[PDB]
Structure 1
Amino acid sequence: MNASEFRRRGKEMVDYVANYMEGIEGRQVYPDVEPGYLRPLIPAAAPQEPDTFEDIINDVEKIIMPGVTHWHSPYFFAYFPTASSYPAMLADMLCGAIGCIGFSWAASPACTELETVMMDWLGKMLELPKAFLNEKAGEGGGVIQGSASEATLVALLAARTKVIHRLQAASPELTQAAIMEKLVAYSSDQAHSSVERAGLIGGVKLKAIPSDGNFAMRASALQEALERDKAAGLIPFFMVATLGTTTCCSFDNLLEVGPICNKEDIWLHVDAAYAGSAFICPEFRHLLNGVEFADSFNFNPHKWLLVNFDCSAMWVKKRTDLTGAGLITDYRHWQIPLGRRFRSLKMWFVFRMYGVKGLQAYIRKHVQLSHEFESLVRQDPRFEICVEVILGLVCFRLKGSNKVNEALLQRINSAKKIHLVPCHLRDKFVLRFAICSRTVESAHVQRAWEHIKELAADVLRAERE
């Protein structure tokens, strides 16, 4: 293609995208295809001569869309939201056009420099302690990671290098491998699987701290684990404290866990992948209190701050602690990959085109809708809410057996009107209702509950026979 043909086809793509978005409520949210559906429907080899754009876009509708789960349908209530906004889409077109690989300052100065400023913009919107901000001064700063899973790995690796160097400074004869045998990392029993994966990749032991009745990590359980493992000869070195657990959006107590991690020389990484976006609202900022004790803090604008994937935001207090693993000129030693694209354009466009107040309104509407769903559940005594509703997630279930709730879930996902996923809280099977779509409204939440309520009656009937 030349640029003149892209002028025509790019504008046709813009219309196609806007059409898909404007009609998305008419899409079945979860697909009917079975695993393996796609390969029989397209050729076994690439074409030798070019295909037409018309044939390709026809295949998008005919072959791709039947296998799409529509994350941005208002009836998608699964997992956590992922971001979809037109400002991020516009920036992503510009990002691909500039097309730089920012593995060094010289590879495109603006790619690195805009990113550092946007991470300070974001840090200030979250009212982060100044130690995390760059502002061309001090030792802290922020970087975009590809994902919170990668951000957790990066923090673990930095923590690993820091403790190896400290332990070898104390015992110069001590090998890296002898230290490796004794290192242990911690997270909540509600932590995301990215923590377990970081421990496996990092080659260290990982232990779950039992959570309290609110599924929060507390000082007492942490102290009990530390006493046990230190007596066994393990060396605590890394902690992931979670704000907004994937299971039930619970919150680890940083005011309790922070001081303990500091005094134990445990690198404290705060994972707020989903919940972090709400901390731009002052009524939720208290859930972040204690981040001043953290060594690193991470959350995903690409979940709940309208910056399309990929965009994970990570700050550290000491750049030097992170690199070994004022002006920031490159990010090579802040991330796993060397190459990176101009992702800060997406943050710039979203922040500027929505404004801080526009993002706050977006968060608050989602939380209000969550409370609307919760209100409906609390009116039906056949159901129970298992965890306090704070952000855009409601954990609910039919009172009674796990089997009846497994049946309810299977009826919901078989009817394919809405989409949600479950979790386990201890031995209890629980349904999750996550407010996801940028365009979801009260009417969608109410119809989803009406649907759930109807299927529950059929399921409860079948259990008495």
Structure 2
Amino acid sequence: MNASEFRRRGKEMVDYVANYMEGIEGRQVYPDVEPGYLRPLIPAAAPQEPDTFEDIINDVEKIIMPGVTHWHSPYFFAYFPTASSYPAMLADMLCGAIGSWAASPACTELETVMMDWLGKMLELPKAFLNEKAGEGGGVIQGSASEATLVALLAARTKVIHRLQAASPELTQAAIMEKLVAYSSDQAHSSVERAGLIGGVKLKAIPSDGNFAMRASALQEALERDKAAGLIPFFMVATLGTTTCCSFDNLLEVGPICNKEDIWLHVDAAYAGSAFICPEFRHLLNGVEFADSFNFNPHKWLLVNFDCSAMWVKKRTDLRFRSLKMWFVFRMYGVKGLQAYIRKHVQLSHEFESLVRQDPRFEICVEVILGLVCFRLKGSNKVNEALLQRINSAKKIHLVPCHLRDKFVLRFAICSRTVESAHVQRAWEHIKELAADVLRAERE
């Protein structure tokens, strides 16, 4: 098609897309249609002459939509990794119209500036800023896995140089066999992968009663290891774990890392975004000690998933993406974005209220942000039974996890469209299915 066909069909498409997102409340969260349904609804060969736009869209409603998930609804109470905000979509259109530094000076420079915005919003130390400070800095990464790996390699290179300076005798290989890294029991898969790929031993630290790393468990691990002739060099402290919103106590853990020459990497998961709100900055106290800090802004800052933001204390140790950051930051403002997290935290606590009022259910971890870790009091069996009925019903979606050896229902309020109405109706449904599940238990 030409340009002015596009102005029309494009505007038409903005309309279709808007509608979708407005009435998404109605759609069923899971497709209620089976593998195999599609082949016979569509011609066996491609059309020779062009079909109408009119006819294609109808086909998307009638043929494609039923077979689609609809992760963008308020009733999908799990993190939806590939969601996108409206400003992200606007950018995404322009980002595709355009299509190294030399190739695109705007792409690169905007990266450097947007990281600064992000840095200031979170109120990270000044040292972390790319504002020409000549020290520290920040860069975008594809995955939080990449970041964890970069910090690790950097930490590894660093300890090797230090240890070989002390004793010129030792071999690089000799040192590597002895290197240990640490993370909390609730550390993300992306840490295991980092150490696997980086060629060092990874050990979990026992977390406390609230699933946080508390030093005493850290110090012990260090004593056990230093004396078996191993060498701690690197550690990930998690802020906002993926199992529950658990925060590793940075104030206890950092001072140890400094003393023991351990490199402190802070994996702020998705939670990091919350530090643009003052109520949460105390969870970040201790960042002073950390050598690197990583988080994914996507979940709470509405930016693109493609982006994992990461800073370092010293720059020397170490897709058109900043455009979407720019749009989203500019179209919500800090206060808008704050308003946003703040709304979800409140809906999360509204849900929590509901769970405390039903004596059949217990809450497992302190609710800090959007996620609520809750379960039915009893055996794991009972609860596995329940999550099955919730999914079977295809009305809402929840994902579980284990905590120690306990099966836990995660209720996650992340979606853009969520209101308390939805939480209200969601609770009740869960409530009704528990009733049904509970009868069964007695048989």
Aligned-pair distance for 1:304?
Answer: 1.3
1:149–1:194 contact (8 Å) kept in structure 2: yes
210, 222, 228: which one pairs with 1:232? Answer: 228
1:412–1:455 contact (8 Å) kept in structure 2: yes
Aligned-pair distance for 1:53?
Answer: 5.5
Query: Deviations for 1:348-386, whole angstroms, at most 9, x for unmatched residues?
Result: 111111111111110110000000000000001111001
Query: Deviations for 1:168-216, whole angstroms, at most 9, x for unmatched residues?
Result: 3334454433332222211111111111122222222211111000000
2:152–2:234 contact (8 Å) kept in structure 1: yes
1:182–1:234 contact (8 Å) kept in structure 2: yes
CA 1:83/1:318 → structure 2, altered by over 3 Å: closer, same or farther? farther
CA 1:28/1:227 → structure 2, altered by over 3 Å: closer, same or farther? same
Query: Deviations for 1:405-435, whole angstroms, at most 9, x for unmatched residues?
Result: 0011000011111111111111111101010
CA 1:136/1:397 → structure 2, altered by over 3 Å: closer, same or farther? same
Aligned-pair distance for 1:82?
Answer: 5.8
1:370–1:392 contact (8 Å) kept in structure 2: yes
1:270–1:296 contact (8 Å) kept in structure 2: yes
Query: C-alpha separation between the residues in 1 aligned to 2:326 and 2:224?
Result: 47
CA 1:412/1:106 → structure 2, altered by over 3 Å: closer, same or farther? same
User: Alignment identity in percent?
Assistant: 100
Query: C-alpha separation between the residues in 2 aligned to 1:109 and 1:268?
Result: 33
Query: Deviations for 1:302-344, whole angstroms, at most 9, x for unmatched residues?
Result: 11111132122111111111xxxxxxxxxxxxxxxxxxx2211
394, 414, 418: which one pairs with 1:440? Answer: 418
CA RMSD, Structure 1 to Structure 2 (Å): 2.5
Please list every run of 5 or more consecutive structure 2 residues that lacks an aligned counterpart in the other structure: none
Query: C-alpha separation between the residues in 2 aligned to 1:45 and 1:312?
Result: 42
Aligned-pair distance for 1:122?
Answer: 1.0
1:81–1:437 contact (8 Å) kept in structure 2: no
CA 1:93/1:400 → structure 2, altered by over 3 Å: closer, same or farther? same
1:273–1:303 contact (8 Å) kept in structure 2: no
| Aligned position for 2:128 | 132
Query: C-alpha separation between the residues in 2 aligned to 1:403 and 1:393?
Result: 22
Matched length: 442
1:72–1:436 contact (8 Å) kept in structure 2: no
CA 1:51/1:221 → structure 2, altered by over 3 Å: closer, same or farther? farther
Query: C-alpha separation between the residues in 1 aligned to 2:184 and 2:27?
Result: 38
| Aligned position for 2:104 | 108
2:149–2:194 contact (8 Å) kept in structure 1: yes
Q: Secondary structure at the match of 2:264?
A: strand
354, 358, 364: which one pairs with 1:380? Answer: 358
Query: Deviations for 1:145-181, whole angstroms, at most 9, x for unmatched residues?
Result: 1222222222222222222333333344544333322
Aligned-pair distance for 1:234?
Answer: 1.9
CA 1:255/1:16 → structure 2, altered by over 3 Å: closer, same or farther? same
Query: Deviations for 1:116-141, whole angstroms, at most 9, x for unmatched residues?
Result: 11111111111111011111122111
Q: Secondary structure at the match of 1:291?
A: coil
Q: Secondary structure at the match of 1:405?
A: helix
CA 1:68/1:294 → structure 2, altered by over 3 Å: closer, same or farther? farther
Aligned-pair distance for 1:47?
Answer: 8.8
Between the two structures, name the one with larger relative contact order (CA 8 Å, sep ≥ 6): 1
CA 1:397/1:165 → structure 2, altered by over 3 Å: closer, same or farther? same
CA 1:40/1:186 → structure 2, altered by over 3 Å: closer, same or farther? farther
CA 1:398/1:50 → structure 2, altered by over 3 Å: closer, same or farther? same
2:71–2:80 contact (8 Å) kept in structure 1: no
2:87–2:331 contact (8 Å) kept in structure 1: yes
CA 1:10/1:458 → structure 2, altered by over 3 Å: closer, same or farther? same
| Aligned position for 2:169 | 173
2:356–2:362 contact (8 Å) kept in structure 1: yes
Query: C-alpha separation between the residues in 1 aligned to 2:110 and 2:370?
Result: 31
Please list every run of 5 or more consecutive structure 1 residues that lacks an aligned counterpart in the other structure: 322-340
Aligned-pair distance for 1:11?
Answer: 2.6
CA 1:21/1:315 → structure 2, altered by over 3 Å: closer, same or farther? same
1:118–1:347 contact (8 Å) kept in structure 2: yes
Query: C-alpha separation between the residues in 2 aligned to 1:311 and 1:276?
Result: 13
Q: Secondary structure at the match of 1:453?
A: helix
358, 361, 372: which one pairs with 2:339? Answer: 361
More divergent stretch after superposition (60-69 vs 271-280): 60-69
